[PDB]
Design an enzyme around this catalytic site. Structure first.
Site, PDB file in Angstrom:
ATOM      1  N   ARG B 236      81.733  66.982  -1.722  1.00 13.24           N
ATOM      2  CA  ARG B 236      82.127  66.120  -0.615  1.00 13.24           C
ATOM      3  C   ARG B 236      82.158  67.008   0.619  1.00 13.24           C
ATOM      4  O   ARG B 236      82.434  68.203   0.519  1.00 13.24           O
ATOM      5  CB  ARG B 236      83.505  65.495  -0.865  1.00 13.24           C
ATOM      6  CG  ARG B 236      83.532  64.406  -1.946  1.00 13.24           C
ATOM      7  CD  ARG B 236      82.787  63.128  -1.507  1.00 13.24           C
ATOM      8  NE  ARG B 236      82.873  62.065  -2.511  1.00 13.24           N
ATOM      9  CZ  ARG B 236      81.973  61.855  -3.471  1.00 13.24           C
ATOM     10  NH1 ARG B 236      80.904  62.635  -3.557  1.00 13.24           N
ATOM     11  NH2 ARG B 236      82.143  60.867  -4.347  1.00 13.24           N
ATOM     12  N   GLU B 265      79.851  60.514   6.939  1.00 10.38           N
ATOM     13  CA  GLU B 265      78.596  59.912   6.508  1.00 10.38           C
ATOM     14  C   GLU B 265      78.573  58.429   6.878  1.00 10.38           C
ATOM     15  O   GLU B 265      79.602  57.756   6.842  1.00 10.38           O
ATOM     16  CB  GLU B 265      78.427  60.091   4.993  1.00 10.38           C
ATOM     17  CG  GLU B 265      78.594  61.543   4.526  1.00 10.38           C
ATOM     18  CD  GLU B 265      78.366  61.730   3.039  1.00 10.38           C
ATOM     19  OE1 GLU B 265      78.200  60.719   2.321  1.00 10.38           O
ATOM     20  OE2 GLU B 265      78.362  62.895   2.582  1.00 10.38           O
ATOM     21  N   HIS B 284      73.005  62.553   1.127  1.00  9.05           N
ATOM     22  CA  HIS B 284      73.841  62.225  -0.013  1.00  9.05           C
ATOM     23  C   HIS B 284      73.137  61.371  -1.066  1.00  9.05           C
ATOM     24  O   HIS B 284      73.529  60.231  -1.304  1.00  9.05           O
ATOM     25  CB  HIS B 284      75.119  61.519   0.458  1.00  9.05           C
ATOM     26  CG  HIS B 284      76.221  61.529  -0.554  1.00  9.05           C
ATOM     27  ND1 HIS B 284      77.530  61.244  -0.230  1.00  9.05           N
ATOM     28  CD2 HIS B 284      76.212  61.791  -1.880  1.00  9.05           C
ATOM     29  CE1 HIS B 284      78.280  61.329  -1.314  1.00  9.05           C
ATOM     30  NE2 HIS B 284      77.504  61.661  -2.330  1.00  9.05           N
TER      31      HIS B 284
END
Lengths: 333, 333
Positions: B236, B265, B284
């Site tokens: 993360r 994000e 991601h």
């Protein structure tokens, strides 16, 4: 300093100092075919870079030449058969160089499968609009895990790739002129005939030297056998019919093509350049890394001295030469 | 068709059909906290993605809730303290997903070291002028071989990454919230304290779940310890003080940073976008691969059904819950 050695490239000072401890050296940087023809007779051994070609015409004048140490992983710049007939030992460099190439290759594979190179461009362009755009927008992506990888060429580099792929959960298949059983079970690699491998593999890696027998080994017909599959080349562009590969890509037959080598280098323009998702292209530098570049020189010097000491180096390319001129005959040190 | 399950993300039809065999299902796509707390009372279990936050606010109305199955690797979106207090079992997904993320991570590492992603751009831009241009253009490339790789987090993903790096010739160091003696001898990975690992490693990889304790584990001060080193993040964004990392990159201190995750994000703009050579950035999607994702859906469904059948799933995240509500008490199937 009794054997006479010709260094045909700019080698690292340290490697040179090691060599001078055992032989008299003559520095003749990147000679043309004509220049090398007039000086080659003076040497018991030479250390050559890929750019210098040792043709049959060059060898005609190699009256006392005993060993040729190629300071590279490849040796297509050497007329191997002619060298062998003349009892000349030819060696290549493995070591850290082989490791570096094998590492680079796996990087080409993961990029061709997972599209990281593509995604990097994508995000930098500001295209990452949302989770959905990626996890729905991105075409189908397959992982390396659970796939069957077939490797053509199980030399130093081919073996290094195989060892790295095992933990990725792939099934290994391979083909080589000289079959390696002592490696097969160790790496769990099933030996197969070329075409059988192309049909049964999900991913095919080219780790073959370029010779008259491997030129276009992946011809147009074989490209057809690879519809829906991935092809990775780290040997030479000429191992494949590049025009046929490209066509297969544009037509959507070949799923992907990753290569560090091309038929005509350097490449400034190419049809494959627009296919960012289907290909991974690098400017022939798979063996370019600091550690490797430092090792090559020492390895090349060591390979040449071993022969002149009457010892068979593990990286001897034309092992048949042993029958033509027994190592004892070339021992100087 | 006894338990009622709230599916809060977009799931593949096959996984959903599997779930419908045993439970009545209600699909409520990515609900807000207020929307979810208003309907959460009807469910015995829920399946959720990282974007849906399960908070005390939501759990207050979770009268019949027995299990929370995260359709993902991470679970920082779940308040475990509150779930545990209410005797709610929380699970995550392992298996093919872990394999796919580990594979992806190695791809990021090889790209960060060997610059394949950059070279791919380079060549497509038609800048491959010559061999000399490349070999001189960028020799500062280092190989993964012989390097010390420190992995923070030694769970499923950490282990999968470590297993893959072994054949690359690295030396493994690691840290984990719970030391793993068996992995230490199995993978020959040396346990170290966080700062000791950052100081002795050439490359640092983050494969830790994000918690209050691992928050900014790589803070500003620790970033300075990475001067001249490489950092890879696949967990993360908040695992690192992203601003500090960005500065270390621009100031030429941190040698390289590759990440599939960011503190905010999605990312459409960022200072690191211009650092093509020093970084590798992906939107991601480390777990995005066909085989893996199909497995994720079945795994998330099965982790939920196992709890309701009164079986303790190996993927149980909050083991403490066993002391609040034994598994027999949530058995419905």
């Amino acid at each position: 300093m009794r054997p006479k050695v010709g260094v045909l490239l700019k080698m690292k000072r340290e490697a040179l100092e090691e060599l001078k401890k055992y032989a008299d050296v003559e520095i003749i940087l990147y000679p043309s075919g004509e220049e090398l023809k007039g000086v080659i007779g003076r040497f018991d051994g030479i250390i050559v870079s890929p750019t210098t070609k040792i043709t049959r015409e060059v060898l005609e004048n190699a009256e006392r030449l005993k060993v040729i140490s190629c300071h590279s992983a490849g040796y297509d710049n050497i007329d191997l058969e002619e060298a062998t007939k003349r009892g000349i030992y030819v060696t290549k460099v493995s070591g850290l160089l082989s490791e570096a190439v094998a590492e680079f290759t796996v990087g080409l594979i993961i990029n061709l499968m997972r599209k990281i190179h593509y995604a990097d461009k994508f995000i930098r362009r500001g295209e990452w609009e949302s989770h959905a755009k990626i996890w729905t927008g991105f075409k189908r992506i397959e992982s390396l895990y659970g796939k069957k990888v077939g490797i053509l060429g199980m030399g130093a580099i081919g073996k290094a790739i195989a060892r790295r792929l095992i933990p990725f959960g792939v099934k290994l298949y391979y083909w080589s002129r000289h079959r390696k059983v002592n490696v097969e079970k160790e790496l769990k690699a099933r030996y197969m005939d070329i075409d059988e491998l192309l049909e049964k593999s999900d991913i095919v890696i080219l780790a073959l030297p370029l010779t008259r027998d491997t030129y276009h080994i992946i011809n147009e017909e074989r490209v057809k056998k690879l519809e829906g599959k991935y092809l990775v080349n780290i040997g030479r562009g000429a191992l494949v019919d590049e025009k046929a590969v490209t066509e297969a890509i544009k037509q959507g037959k070949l799923k992907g093509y990753a290569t560090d080598v091309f038929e005509k280098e350097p490449v400034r323009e190419h049809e494959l350049f627009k296919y960012e998702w289907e290909t991974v292209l690098t400017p022939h530098y798979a063996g370019l890394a600091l550690e490797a570049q430092e090792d090559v020189g020492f390895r090349a010097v060591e390979n040449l001295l071993k022969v002149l000491r009457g010892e068979v180096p593990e990286d001897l390319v034309n092992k048949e030469v042993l029958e033509v001129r027994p190592i004892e005959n070339v021992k100087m040190l």
